[PDB]
Amino acid sequence: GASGDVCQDCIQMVTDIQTAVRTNSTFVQALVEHVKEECDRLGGMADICKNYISQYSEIAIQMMMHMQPKEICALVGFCD
C-alpha cells in the first residue's frame, strides 16, 4: 500500500545519497551550508541552530554512512 511505497522510495533515496557522499566532493558541503541558511526560519534562535549543525554535521554524516539504507529509513519511521 501507500506506506510500503514510501518505505521503498526512502531506501532508493538514501542509497543514492550514500553514492553521492562517496562520489560527489561538493554534495555534503552544499547540503550542510543550505541547512545552516534554513536556520533563520526559526524565530529557537538561528545562530544557536547554525552552531548545532556546525559541530554535529561530520559525525552525523559518518554515522549515517556506516548504516544500511533500510536502517536509516526505519530510524526516521518511513520503514516498518
Ligand X SMILES: O=C1C(O)=C([C@H]2CC[C@H](c3ccc(Cl)cc3)CC2)C(=O)c2ccccc21
Count residues near ligand X (CB under 6 A): 6
DSSP class per residue in the chain: -HHHHHHHHHHHHHHHHHHHHHH-TTHHHHHHHHHHHGGGG----HHHHHHHHHHHHHHHHHHHHTS-HHHHHHHHTS--
Q: Binding of a copy of itself at residue 24 (CB under 8 A)?
A: yes
The site for a copy of itself (CB under 8 A) is made up of 1-3, 5-6, 9-10, 12-13, 16-17, 19-20, 23-24, 27, 30-31, 34-35, 38, 75-78, 80
Q: Which residues bind ligand X (CB under 6 A)?
A: 41, 63, 67, 71, 74-75
